[PDB]
Structure formats: structure tokens, C-alpha cells
Amino acid sequence: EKKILQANEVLEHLTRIALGQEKEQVLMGIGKGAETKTHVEVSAKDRIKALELLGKA
Amino acid sequence: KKILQANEVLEHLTRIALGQEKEQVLMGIGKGAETKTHVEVSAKDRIKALELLGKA
Amino acid sequence: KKILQANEVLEHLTRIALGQEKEQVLMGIGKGAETKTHVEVSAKDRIKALELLGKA
Amino acid sequence: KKILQANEVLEHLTRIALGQEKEQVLMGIGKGAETKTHVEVSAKDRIKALELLGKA
Amino acid sequence: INEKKILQANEVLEHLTRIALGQEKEQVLMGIGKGAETKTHVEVSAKDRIKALELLGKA
Amino acid sequence: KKILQANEVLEHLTRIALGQEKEQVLMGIGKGAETKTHVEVSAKDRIKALELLGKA
Amino acid sequence: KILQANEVLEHLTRIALGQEKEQVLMGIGKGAETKTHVEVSAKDRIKALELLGKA
Amino acid sequence: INEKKILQANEVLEHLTRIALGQEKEQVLMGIGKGAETKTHVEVSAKDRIKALELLGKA
Amino acid sequence: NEKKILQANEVLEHLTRIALGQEKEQVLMGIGKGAETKTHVEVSAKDRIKALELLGKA
Amino acid sequence: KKILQANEVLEHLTRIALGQEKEQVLMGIGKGAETKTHVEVSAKDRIKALELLGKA
């Protein structure tokens, strides 16, 4: 569906990030230079940006 | 030729923000050799898309 | 569908500032292999939280 | 000598934003050796294009 | 209702002071060999201490 | 001698934007050894040239 | 408990004068590292000079 | 090589122009194998050319 | 420790030393197989230019 | 205990802009060993010097 997020919906997604509920996909080494995809928790720097945006709203 | 309109810009930003998009990056396959693969758009990029959608 | 209220933003920033949070990172385990682990949030990120708390 | 006009700039940013453009990068093929290859334009760059498109 | 902790203005300054006075550490990954790492704590860096000092100067 | 004037600036940015230019980069040839080679101008740099062309 | 303006300037001065150190990781071979102290960098000392000049 | 020369306005723009037109190079370190490096010259990068162009447009 | 505060004039004298190429900074230098030693190197151009920028504004 | 005069700032900036200055860097000589060497000041730094001279 063609969807445009409205203001409250932006804040709901930002809230999930801030609360530590989201992950992101990165490459992880598995030996000798080979890598696999994996998910990690979203980093503090990103959570803080989400909080900073929430606090401005 | 296509110029994306203001609403079209917000729709693409939304796809990104909602985690529906990928980007192509290089992944190690061993001994320095790499291959092209797709990964999810990173949180930092999603947060940028959210930030712009909040300014809409 | 939660939206963090003003107080709740500051409470979260406080947890970070006070050194109570961690972040998940990749740590080398030899010859290119890595494992996920948690490390304390960095001083740079804590100081940003402190700066935000000082403005509030 | 050509100068890209207003509408032309937006046409080019649109191709980028839509995921239709590539860039040439260096990819490993083993033991330090690299080859030139094309990859999709990254999400960060698409986001910049979408931002510029949204502000015109 | 349980009122969770929000750091107060004086307390932000007290934490920044600890940092600026060189009394704080952060956890980093340190190399131990062959691509392997271990966790250790290091003194907060001069760059971070200067950011703290700057914020203290303005407060 | 030559000072580029405003239109000449826009002509050069136009070449960059249209993907007609290259830059010289160091490419790996094995075991740390490198060679000077040329690759297309990157999307980030093309987008900067587009941004500048749109502001004119 | 809280550094006041003058103590801030004293601390920035120490840094600007090249009297301060910071802890960093130094290689000791084969990927291993040890913690050591190094003089605070020129970039940092210049930031401190900049803040001192605006005092 | 006069050590006390000061560039005039038009000489600044002449120098930026040489950069923009791809006439200049910079000295960088290039790998020659097993960690050994040599000094070499490369063309000025597109990023630096674009900054020179931007400056010329701001004149 | 022996406390001191730099005055406006001392700020400029120390920037001038940097800008004139008279100062050094400590860095780590490789000595082989990943091992490093401390060494002193001249202050970099980028840092001398920032000093010159500040001196120019004063 | 010199303080650079305004003209002396510009003279120094001019040396850099004209390609006459060098900076000291570390250069690999093999197996991880490095040596101090001098290289020309980079284009990015020459361009900054140019920008500052242009504002004078």
C-alpha cells in the first residue's frame, strides 16, 4: 500500500527504537574474511537520536 | 520524464521508515574476496526518513 | 501503540546517562570470526544524554 | 556546453531516489586484489535525493 | 504511580564534573591477538573530557 | 590566467552530474600493493553537483 | 562536587599547555594491545585554546 | 618563492580554477606490497574539485 | 597539582607556536608485526590551519 | 613570545595555498614498521587555505 506516515505514526516508530525494541541487519565475520548477515540491537547513538526527536515533539 | 511529486517523496520515505527497503552492499566470502548482497536499510537511515516525515 | 511522553524521554536519557544501559556489538574471537556481545554505552553517548538532560 | 536546467536536476534526483542508478566501487577478489564493479546507489544517498526533491 | 528517576540539573553537573576530573571510565574492546578482542575499561578520552568541560563552562 | 565564471562553474558541475567524469583512486592489486586507477565519480559527489546546479 | 567557571578554565589550561595525558590502546604485536598514556593531541589542545580564547 | 607573498583576490580564484579544471595533483602514500609504501602523486579528487567549483561560484 | 589559567594573550602565543610549526604531538608509530612505539610528530597541516583561522579572527 | 599579526596569518596561509608547505606523516616500510616522512600538504588543506584567503 502507498502509505505516508503521519506525525503520530512517526512518534510511534521512534518510540519503538527508543525503547530498545528494534534491530538492524549487519554483516558479521565468521572466519577467514567470510561474513554472514545477522541482526543486532539498534545502537545507543541511534536510540538517543530517537529520544531527542521524541523530546522535541 | 518523471519528477517525483511531494507526496511521492513522502511515500518513498515511508517505505524506508517502515523497514521495507534494502540496500546493496559488499559481503566478504573469504580471503578478501567479496560478493554483492542486499541488506536491510540501517537504523540510522530509517531515523533520518522518520525525521523528514515528521517535518512533513 | 506507545508514544513516549516528555517525562519518559528524560527517564530513558537518565538510564543512559547513569551508565545503566548497554549496547550490542560484534567482538572479534580470532581469525576473522566475531560473536555478538554487550558493552556499556560509551562516554560520548552518555555525555550526549547528559547534555540533553541539562537542557530539559 | 550544457548546463542542467531546473527540471533536469529534479529528473536526475528522481532516478536516484527511485533506485535506478548505480555507482562504481572497488570490490575485493582475494588477497588484497580488487576489481571495479557497479552497485546500487546507497540508501543514505537516496535519502538525500528524496530530501532535495521534497524541498523544491 | 512510581516516579522513575530523572536526573536533575545539579546532578547532570555533578556527573559531568566526575568526567572532567578524570574519575570516569568507559568500556571498550581491546585487541588480544589474531583478530580476537576482550572487554576492558579505559579512562574517558580527552575529547569527551573537553565536551564535559565545555558544558560545565556554560552551565 | 583563467578564472572560471559562474556559467563555466555550472558547465563543470553538469559534466559531473551527468556521470561524464572520473577520479583517480588507489586500487588493490594484492598483498597490500596498489595501482593508480580511475573510477566514475561517486553518487554522493554527483548529488552534491546536482544540489549546486539546482540552487543556481 | 561541581566545577565552577574558574576551575573549568584551569582544567582547559592544563590541556592547552600540553600537560595532560589520555589513555589509549597501543599495539604490542600480532593484534594484541595494551593500555598506555599519550599526550593529549594537538586537535584537542586547539579546542581547549579555542574555549580559552572565548572566555 | 617569496616567503612573505600574500595571494590577491584574483590569484585565489586562479588557484581554485586550476584545481577545478583537473590541473593539480596531491601527494599521497601508495602501497607497494607487504605494508611498504611509497610517495606518489594522484589527481585531486572529485570532492575537492567540487569544493573548488562551489567556491568559484560564490565569488 | 599546580593550577593556572591562560589569558587572552597567552592563548594567542600558544596558537602562534602551533601555526609557526614549532609544536609537536605524540602518536603511536608501528615498529613491526603490529607492535607500536610512542613517537613525536610535527603538528599536522589541518591543525596549523585551524590555529591560523583562530589567529585570523582575534 | 610572538603573536602572529594579521598579515603574517595571510602569508602563512599563502604558503600553504601555493603548494610550498609539507607535513610530517608516518609511512609504512614493511611488515607493520613505519617511518616518519614529509609529504606535500593535501588539496583539502590547500583549499581551506584558499577559502580563508578569499574571505580576507
Mode of pairing for the β-strands spanning D33-40 and D22-30: antiparallel
CB contact under 8 A, J17 and H27: no
Name the E strands within D1-56.
Answer: 22-30, 33-40
Question: What CA–CA distance (Å, rounded) separates G7 from E45?
Answer: 19
J10 secondary structure, DSSP code = H
Question: What CA–CA distance (Å, rounded) separates C36 from F8?
Answer: 53
What type of residue sits at position D25? Answer: V
E45 secondary structure, DSSP code = P
**Elucidated via:** X-ray
Closest-CA residue of chain F to H37? F33
Residue E58 distance to chain C (closest CA, Å): 11
What are the angstrom distances between the C-alpha of H40 and each of F19, F51, H37, J40? 27, 33, 9, 10
Question: What CA–CA distance (Å, rounded) separates B45 from B51?
Answer: 10
User: DSSP assignment of G16-32, as one string?
Assistant: HTT--EEEEEEEEETTE
Mode of pairing for the β-strands spanning F22-30 and F33-40: antiparallel
The number of domains in chain F is 1
Task: Tell me how crowded residue E37 is: count the other CB atoms within 10 A of its CB.
Answer: 23
Interface of A with B in 1-57 (CB under 8 A): 2-5, 7, 10-11, 13-14, 17, 22, 24-27, 29, 32-35, 37, 42-43, 45-46, 49-50, 53, 57
Q: Are H26 and J38 in contact (CB under 8 A)?
A: no
Chain B residues close to A29, C-beta within 8 Å: 28
What type of residue sits at position E19? Answer: I
What type of residue sits at position J39? Answer: V
CATH assignment at residue B40: 6.10.140.2160
What type of residue sits at position D36? Answer: K
Question: What CA–CA distance (Å, rounded) separates E11 from I10?
Answer: 34
Domain enclosing residue D50, as ranges: 1-56
Q: What is the resolution of this structure in A?
A: 1.9
Q: C-alpha cell of G38? A: 599519550
Distance, CA of C13 to chain centre: 8
